[PDB]
């Protein structure tokens, strides 16, 4: 949804929201409408990848490791709009129905699904006082072991002998369907994530905060697990800044050379230089007013 | 800060270099300005017809490689493809 | 230059660009041609012919 | 969680424990296994 350039981002977002509220129910079975992050097409600050050549873990492990520990350690950093996973394999409990077992056991594809999607929940049965205490009635029902899979009831004779899922299918664990793949240095495919910055906020700031947060997990990560970094923005930022810092120290000296060249009394040089810092100070001060970013070009003039 | 800290805290030959030149320009005062302001028009015209290409480019340290192929590729071959190139890079 | 000559496969047309500049170009919904024509309709079959 | 094998391989041989080298969504197993050898 494109707006008239200039309008407030959050306005637009809080605007589109009202016509997305009435369109949520109209959406198919279980597809949701995810809203774009509070960032733009530049928020991509820091990218990294999880690896392990010890062989103690694998893709399935690493991505999970990323989705339940890393993403949650990074999305909790000031001014980080989103931590997106990249090219990973998600563990999927894939039940593979054998067509022939179905015919032989008198069970239909339609039946198996309805039976499956009715044996994986937990139930609450209010409370129950006793000893003046409040006892809560919990009821198990989640799937935990693969046995809980094999033991999904599909058909039960009057006799008392049931027909389980294990009789019409096998329950192998495998990967999911992927929309994108990530590969590291040609010597292996792995999973990682990128750190996306809250549009308006400070880059180098977050980048730093992030890095030192990683120098904390380097003692909390599993054995064999190491986080190889793939993209650092601070490197360029620091260099571009170190460039400008040197050039401003160039002309300081240049002026000190010229105004003290024709004017022997050299003390007139250092006093002519204090016009630079102020000419720039009185600038950044008015820059803050507009609150406009201080990028490479805003450092060109 | 100028007079408050300049008082608190070849110059001959160089000026000479330029001086005679004013005697050289104050010759035919009106016409000299009409050929200089003409050297502007004259030099500006064939100096614009030279190169003129799209606007900016900012080179970062590390670079991005995007290679595109025909549509309809499998997440297997496309993944293999990704490894092929990465090993070459 | 060496990369564009080394890294290359059949069908895979190579291209090189800057990260940030690319990301901008990416999410950029729009048209590159100085002049563009949008033929809209009801059924794709018709407009595609236009 | 363990399959008794009738043949195919002898004792000792190291074998990776993952069907996670293919893509569950139609990564033609026969073909995907081919990419691993040349």
């Amino acid at each position: 949804v494109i707006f008239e350039d200039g309008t407030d981002p959050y306005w637009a977002r809080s605007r589109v929201l009202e016509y997305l509220n009435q369109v949520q129910g109209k959406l198919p079975a279980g597809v949701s409408a995810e809203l774009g992050p509070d960032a733009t097409g530049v928020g991509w600050i820091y990218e990294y990848a999880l690896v392990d050549r010890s062989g103690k873990h694998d893709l399935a492990d690493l991505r999970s490791l990323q989705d339940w520990f890393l993403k949650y350690e990074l999305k909790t950093i000031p001014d980080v709009a989103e931590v997106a996973s990249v090219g990973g394999v998600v563990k999927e409990y894939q039940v593979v129905i054998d067509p022939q077992r179905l015919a032989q056991y008198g069970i239909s594809l339609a039946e198996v699904k309805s039976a499956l999607d009715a044996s994986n929940q937990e139930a609450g049965g209010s409370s129950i006082e006793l000893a003046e205490a409040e006892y809560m009635v919990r009821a198990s029902g989640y799937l935990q072991t693969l046995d809980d899979f094999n033991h999904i009831v599909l058909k039960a004779s009057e006799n008392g002998v049931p027909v389980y899922l294990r009789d019409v299918a096998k329950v192998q664990i495998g990967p999911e369907m992927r929309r994108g793949i990530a590969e590291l240095n040609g010597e292996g495919e792995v999973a990682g994530g990128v750190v996306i910055l809250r549009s308006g906020k400070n880059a180098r700031e977050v980048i730093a905060a992030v890095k030192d947060k990683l120098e904390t997990l380097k003692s909390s990560l599993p054995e064999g697990v190491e986080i190889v970094t793939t993209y650092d923005r601070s490197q360029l930022i620091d260099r571009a800044i170190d460039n400008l810092s040197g050039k401003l120290l160039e002309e300081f000296i240049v002026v000190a050379v010229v105004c003290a060249l024709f004017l022997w009394h050299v003390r007139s040089a250092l006093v002519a230089i204090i016009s630079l810092p102020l000419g720039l100070c009185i600038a950044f001060i008015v820059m803050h007013f507009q609150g406009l970013n201080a990028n490479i070009m805003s450092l060109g003039g | 800060v100028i007079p408050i800290l300049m008082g608190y805290w070849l110059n001959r030959f160089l000026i000479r270099v330029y001086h005679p030149l004013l005697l050289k320009v104050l010759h035919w005062p009106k016409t000299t300005l009409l050929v200089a302001a003409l050297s502007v028009l004259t030099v500006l015209w064939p100096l614009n017809k030279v190169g003129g290409e799209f606007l900016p480019q900012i080179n970062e340290g590390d670079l991005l490689y995007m290679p595109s192929t025909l549509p309809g590729i499998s997440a297997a071959e496309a993944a293999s493809m990704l490894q092929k190139t990465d090993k070459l890079i | 230059e060496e990369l564009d000559n080394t890294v290359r496969l059949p069908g895979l047309a190579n291209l090189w660009v800057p990260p940030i500049r690319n990301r901008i170009d990416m999410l950029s919904t729009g048209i590159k041609s100085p002049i563009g024509i949008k033929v809209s309709g009801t059924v794709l079959a018709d407009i595609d012919a236009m | 969680g363990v399959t008794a094998l009738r043949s195919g391989l002898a004792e000792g041989e190291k074998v990776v424990s993952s069907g996670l080298f293919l893509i569950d969504s139609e990564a033609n197993i026969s073909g995907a296994l081919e990419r691993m050898r040349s």
């Binding site: - | 092929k84 | - | 363990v2 190291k14 080298f21 040349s38």
Partner: peptide, 26 residues
């Protein structure tokens, strides 16, 4: 004009769990 050679085969050194074949009862 780069005769650079490369290994076509799939490669993985960044995450592969391996197990050893054994003799025992089910």
């Amino acid at each position: 004009a780069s005769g650079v050679r490369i290994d076509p085969t799939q490669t993985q050194n960044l995450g592969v769990k391996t197990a050893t074949v054994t003799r025992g009862p089910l």
